[PDB]
């Protein structure tokens, strides 16, 4: 009946703002789940979740907040070399989704990463394996 949402928090090891073979996971990371409504454009509820092993965070949504606009936001990191939240120009990197499932099956959300201060030196090797021009904005 309820909604099970799963997600992971990685340390963006290479400052790629996505997840590579060099990325590492963060347990004890801060994550905010927030939802809005259509009839008001307003809030509906807010819950804070924390990541366990493999950076997995989990949250159970009762169906009183059924099918509403929801976005996730990074809050805290267990790790000071990876304490920076990468902004995309002028916005915090949200992770928008809408609250729906069938057969009650868990919905796994895309991951979110914290930026490291010093990019690893083996990163040019990684972007080269994915054959992309390394981002430097």
**Residues binding its own copies (CB under 8 A):** 5-6, 8, 10, 16-21, 23, 25, 39, 54, 56, 69-71, 88-91, 95-98, 107-111, 129-137
- Please, which residues have CB within 8 angstroms of residue 64's CB and are 6 or more apart in sequence? none
Polymer length of the chain: 137
Q: How far apart are CA 5 and CA 99, in angstroms?
A: 9
Q: How far apart are CA 35 and CA 67, in angstroms?
A: 10
Least Å from the CB of residue 79 to its own copies? 17
Residues 53-92, one symbol each (x = binds Ni ion by CB under 5 A, - = not), give -----------x----------------------------
Q: Which of Ni ion, its own copies, none does residue 91 bind (CB under 5 to 8 Å by kind)? A: its own copies
Least Å from the CB of residue 74 to its own copies? 15
- 73 three-class SS: strand
Tell me which residue of 49, 89, 41, 44 sits closest to 72, measured CA to CA. Answer: 49
Least Å from the CB of residue 108 to its own copies? 5
Is residue 45 a contact residue for Ni ion (CB under 5 A)? yes
**For residues 44 and 78, which CB has a smaller minimum distance to Ni ion in the complex?**
44
Tell me which residue of 65, 84, 70, 66 sits closest to 26, measured CA to CA. Answer: 84
Q: Which of Ni ion, its own copies, none does residue 118 bind (CB under 5 to 8 Å by kind)? A: none
Strand partners, 114: 11
């Amino acid at each position: 009946s309820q909604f099970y949402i799963q997600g992971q928090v990685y340390c963006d090891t290479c400052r790629a703002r996505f997840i590579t073979e060099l990325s590492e996971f963060i347990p004890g990371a801060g994550v905010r789940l927030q939802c809005k409504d259509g009839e008001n454009g307003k809030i509906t509820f807010t819950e804070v979740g924390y990541t366990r092993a493999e950076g997995l965070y989990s949250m159970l949504i009762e169906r009183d907040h059924k099918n509403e606009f929801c976005e996730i936001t990074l809050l805290s990191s267990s790790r000071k070399d990876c304490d920076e939240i990468p902004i995309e120009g002028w916005v915090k990197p949200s992770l928008k989704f809408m609250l729906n499932t069938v057969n009650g099956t868990t919905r796994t959300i895309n991951p979110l990463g914290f930026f490291k201060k010093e990019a690893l030196p083996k990163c040019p090797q990684v972007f080269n394996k994915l054959g992309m021009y390394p981002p430097n904005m």
